[PDB]
Amino acid sequence: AISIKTPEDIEKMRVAGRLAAEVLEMIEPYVKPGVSTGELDRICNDYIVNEQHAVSACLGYHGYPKSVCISINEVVCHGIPDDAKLLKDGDIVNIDVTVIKDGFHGDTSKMFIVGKPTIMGERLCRITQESLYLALRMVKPGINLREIGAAIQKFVEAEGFSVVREYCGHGIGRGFHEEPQVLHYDSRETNVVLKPGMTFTIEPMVNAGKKEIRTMKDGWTVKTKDRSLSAQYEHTIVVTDNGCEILTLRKDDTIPAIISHDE
């Protein structure tokens, strides 16, 4: 019950993933001590709207009030950009971007570490990305989604950290969230066998504490229950004939765009 994208389709995703990636590239200089999350959102949307000639998929999505999600430190996901929340030395910050261009969505996020790094967030953010990369390397036709989740979770826990269970990566294309669900863990519920032309995200959330999370009274903001740090990276990809292609790759990613398992 998963759409297989045509070559036209795939290329529209290329463009949409690139624009989403470039939002995250454009915003980096602004991710600085003193800056508010509200203005980062304004910058991102202005860019998406005026220069990208695109839309944010997030705005209005289940009533979501801003254009990107900005999650700071213990906030796991769906943190709401707010003119009064200021970035400070030490912070680890996720900005999650999704744009729609030409019928198609690109969906991506990364961690920024604000001003003077702290130490254990340096590590959480690193491990969380390494966990995304190891999943991206497994992706190829005929492998099962379940191996991928099981393999993320192993890595993450072996570090002292946990995988958040409530939120998962997702098929993506003309719909924001299409099949399949891409769990970052082993559940025997999961059985998807991958095939060229599927497009989906992988977006593990990792807590330096324990795996349990909590939603706030704004009905959006998810925090860790034990108030530890949590980190997330996300890429949108296409299954290729012999591996994958990352459609949201940034200049700062240290994994190649084209991952090929062929001889």
Ligand X SMILES: CCCC[C@@H](N)[C@H](O)C(=O)N[C@@H](CO)C(=O)N[C@@H](CC(C)C)C(=O)OC
- Residues in the site for Na ion, rule: CB under 5 A? 71, 230
| Per-residue interface string for the shown chain with ligand X, residues 189-228, x marking contact by CB under 6 A | --------------x-------------------------
Position 58 contacts ligand X (CB under 6 A): yes
| Per-residue interface string for the shown chain with ligand X, residues 74-93, x marking contact by CB under 6 A | ---xx---------------
Q: Which of 43, 151, 168, 231 binds ligand X (CB under 6 A)?
A: 168
By C-beta, is 129 or 230 nearer to Na ion? 230
Inter-residue contact 139 to 246 (CB < 8 Å): no
**Helix residue spans in the chain (DSSP H):** 7-27, 37-46, 119-138, 145-157
Query: Annotation-wise, does 170 bind a ligand?
Result: yes
Which one of 58-66, 111-119, 139-147, 155-163 is the stretch in contact with ligand X (CB under 6 A)? 58-66
Q: Which of 38, 39, 64, 117 binds ligand X (CB under 6 A)?
A: 64
Mapped onto helix, strand or coil, the DSSP state of residue 211 is coil
Binding at 230: pick from ligand X, Na ion, Co ion, none (beta carbon under 5-8 Å per type)? Na ion
Q: Which of 263, 205, 214 is nearest to 232 (CA)?
A: 205
Question: Please, what is the angle between helix 37-46 and helix 7-27, to 10°?
Answer: 140
By C-beta, is 34 or 60 nearer to Co ion? 60
Name residue 21's amino acid.
Answer: A
Cβ-proximal residues to 175 (8 Å cutoff; 6+ apart), any chain:
105
Rg, Å, the chain Cα set: 17
Query: Annotation-wise, does 78 bind a ligand?
Result: yes
Binding at 252: pick from Co ion, ligand X, Na ion, none (beta carbon under 5-8 Å per type)? none
Rounded to whole angstroms, how far apart are CA atoms 48 and 56?
7
Rounded to whole angstroms, how far apart are CA atoms 73 and 113?
10
Q: Is the peptide bond before 180 cis (omega within 30 degrees of 0)?
A: yes
Which one of 17-25, 81-89, 104-112, 188-196 is the stretch in contact with Co ion (CB under 5 A)? 104-112
Residues annotated within the binding site for substrate are: 78, 98, 177
Residues in the site for Co ion, rule: CB under 5 A? Answer: 96, 107, 201, 234
Residues annotated within the binding site are: 78, 96, 98, 107, 170, 177, 203, 234
